[PDB]
Symmetry: D2
Subunit: 223 residues, 4 copies
Amino acid sequence: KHGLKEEMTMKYHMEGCVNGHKFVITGEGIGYPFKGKQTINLCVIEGGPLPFSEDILSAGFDRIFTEYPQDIVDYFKNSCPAGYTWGRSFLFEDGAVCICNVDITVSVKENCIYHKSIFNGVNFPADGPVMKKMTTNWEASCEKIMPVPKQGILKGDVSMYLLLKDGGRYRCQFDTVYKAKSVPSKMPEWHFIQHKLLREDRSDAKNQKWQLTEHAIAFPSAL
Amino acid sequence: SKHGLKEEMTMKYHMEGCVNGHKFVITGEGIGYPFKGKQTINLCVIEGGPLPFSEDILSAGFDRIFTEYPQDIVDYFKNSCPAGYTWGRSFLFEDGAVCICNVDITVSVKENCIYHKSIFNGVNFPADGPVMKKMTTNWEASCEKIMPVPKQGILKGDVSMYLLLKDGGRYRCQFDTVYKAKSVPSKMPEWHFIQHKLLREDRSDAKNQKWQLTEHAIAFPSAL
Amino acid sequence: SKHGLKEEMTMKYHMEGCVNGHKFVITGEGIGYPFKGKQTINLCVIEGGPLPFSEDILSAGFDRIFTEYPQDIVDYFKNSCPAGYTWGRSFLFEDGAVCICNVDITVSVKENCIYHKSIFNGVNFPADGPVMKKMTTNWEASCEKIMPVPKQGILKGDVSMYLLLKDGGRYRCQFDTVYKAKSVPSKMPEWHFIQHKLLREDRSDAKNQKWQLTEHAIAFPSAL
Amino acid sequence: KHGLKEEMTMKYHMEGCVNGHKFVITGEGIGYPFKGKQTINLCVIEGGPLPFSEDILSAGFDRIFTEYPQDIVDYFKNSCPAGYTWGRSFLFEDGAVCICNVDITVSVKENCIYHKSIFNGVNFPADGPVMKKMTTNWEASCEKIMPVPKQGILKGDVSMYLLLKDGGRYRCQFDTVYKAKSVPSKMPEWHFIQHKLLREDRSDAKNQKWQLTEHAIAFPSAL
C-alpha cells in the first residue's frame, strides 16, 4: 500500500556544513515501515574525520518508519510513494543552532526509499561536548505531532536530550514542519510519537562510518 | 498509609498573584485520590475579581502527589510526604509573555488534608492576545518528561504545553519545573514520563468568580 | 518643576521577593538627579538575610525617570509624573533561570520623593551556577532599545544584558520590559536608545546585609 | 593597510535554501571600508522570483565595512587580506530560524573583496510577513561585539527588527561568531556597532534584482 512492502531498502545523501566544516555523507539501510523500525549505515565521503560528534546528524537522515495504529491517520505513509519533505530547527542549550531540510521519495521499482538531506549548523563552542565529541546517544523521546488544518501540514515538537559521557544531558529543541508533496485527503488529529534511537561507531583507518537504529511508535493522547 | 497519605484525601489552596500588574488572591478546596492520580478542585477569586485575564494560565499553578505511579518507578512526591515538597516553574508563552510560579505543599495528617500555598506572577501578555482577551478553552493533554538531578536530590520537569483557543487554534507555552523535597530523599527515580489531562469549567456568576479543575495524571517509563 | 520633579530629588524602595524559593524583603533610600540621569541608592536586607544568592540579579529591579533625555525626544517617564508609572520585566538567563519583576513608581510632591514598590520572583537558578554561588561582579554597560506601542499608549524595552563574573567571563540575560504610564499620554516618543551603566558596592557587615548602586543613564537617537 | 584602499570593489555569491526553496544570487559593490559605508547590487540567477522577502538575506552578503575609531582594535581589517569567516543564527519572533555562513577574502591585485555565502532557513509560516513579502526594511540597530579571550574570536549579539508594511515590527535575534583566518596579535575590548541598512528593489521583467546600502560605525561603551 502506497508503494511500500513490509521490508524495504533505503538510501541517504547528506550535504552539510557544521561550524564552517563542509562534509558529505551517504548511507544505505534496511527498514520495516509497518513495524516502525529501521537501521542504516553511514560513511563520510568528504571532510572525514568530522571535527564534531556523529550524534547531531542522527535526526538528519523519516516518519514513514513509525508504527501507526489503525485509528490514527498515517500522514507520512499516505504521502507515498511521491513522498514528502521536512525542515527542522535544532536549538541546543549552549546556544548552537542547526537547521536540516530533507526530501524523501519512494522508488517502487527498487522498493527503495531515497533521502536527500541538506544540513547546516553554527556557533557550537569549540570546547563544547559536540566539537569535543563527548556525546553517547540521544535519550528516548516523546514527540508531539499536530495538524495544521488549513495548510495541509504537520508540526513536530520535541525536547531532545543528548547523553554526555560524564553522565549529564545536553538539551536540544527540535521543531519540525512535515509537508507532503500531494494534497492529503485525510488529516490526523494530534498524537504522540515515541522514539528510541541508537548509534555505534564503526570507523576504521580509511573511512569514518557508523550505524544508526531507530524504533518509533505513534500513540494517542491516552489517557 | 505510610506517608501521611490515604486513598482518598482532601486539599486546600491559597494563591497570591499579580499578572500584567493586576493583583489577585484565590483560594479553593478539593478532593483527591493520590494513588489513582485523580484530583478535583473548586476555586474562588476572593480579591481582585473579575480577573482581567484567562483563568487557564493559573491551572497548572495550583501537585505531582496526584500521579498514578506504577510500582516499578520511585514516586519521589509521595515519598516526600508528609513534610512534602516545593516547586518553582517557568512558563514561556509563544507571544513572549512570561510567568513564574512557586509552590509549597505540605500534608496535615490530622486533617488528612494537603496544603498548597502558591505565588504566581506574570508579565508582558499582549493586551490584544488570547490570554488578556480570554480566548482560551483548555490546556491540551500533555506528556511531561521528569528527570533526576542525582547530586542535587531534586527533579526537573520539562514539557511543551498547548492551550486551546476558541477559534480552534493552539497557543504554546514552555513549562520548566524544579521539584524539591524538603527532606533529603534516599531513593531517586530514573527519568520517566508523566502524562497529564486537565480540564476546567467556569462556575462563575454575579457574586463571585468561580471554577473547577479536573486533573488526571499517570507516570510511565519509556514505551520501548 | 512641572511634573512633581526637581533637579535634585530623593527616593525610597520596598522589594518583596522570592528567588529559588527563598523569601526576602529589602528597602532603601536614595538621592537622584532625574534631569542628569544620575541616581545613587543604599539598600538593606530586612527579612531573609543573608541572601543565598547574588545581589546583582536585583539591581535592575529596584526607574527611567532617571534618564537624561535630549530635548528632541519625548521623555515619556518624566511626562508620566507625578502620578508616575509602572513596569513589568522578564529576565531570561543563559543557564535557563527566569525572573519576573513588577514595579510601581509614584512621586510625593510634598516630600519631593519618588516611591518604588517592587515585586521580584525568580526560579530554577542552578545551585552550582554563578548566581547561587555569588560569582558575579557587575552588570556590564548596556544599550537598551525603547520602542513605542502607539495604540496601547505604552513603551517596550529590549536589551541583552551581561553580568560579569569574577573569573573574567560574561553571563547573559535577556531583559524584556513593558513601561506603562498610569495616565493616558498625549505625546509618544519615536523609538530610541538608552545606554545604562550600573555599578554596585557591597557595604555589608555582621549585623545587616547592605549595598550601594550607582546608575547613570542617557537616551540617544540612532547615531546615523 | 592590510590590503585595502579607501575605495574598494566587492563581490558576492550566495547559495541558499529557504523553506525548501533553492536559489542562487550574485552581486557586485563599491565600498568605503574606512568610512564604514558600502553599496551592493544583487541579482538572482536561480530560483527567481523568490517566494520570500528580500530582507531576510541582507545580513547574509562584512564588518570590514565599519568605521572604527583609532582607540578600538579593528579585528576585521586586522584579519585582512587573508580575511575572515562568520556563522550566524537568526531567530525570528514567529518561530522561523535561518543560519548563515560566510567566507570573506581580499584580492590585493583586484583590490576587491570576495564573499561566498551559504544561507539556509526553515519553518517560515506560509502566510507570514516573510513568505508573503510584507517587509520594508531592517530598522537601525546597535550590535554588541565582545571578545572571546582564549579562542581568539568575536561574538555578535543584536536584537533586530524588520519593519512591516502595516507599520509594525518583526523581531529577529542575530547571534554571530567572527573568526579571523590568522591568529590575531591584538584583541578588542567589547564595544558597540551601530548599523543602518537599506533596500530598494530594482526588479524587472527578466531578473530579480535589488540594491542594499549599509553604514556602520563602532562606538564604545560610552558613557
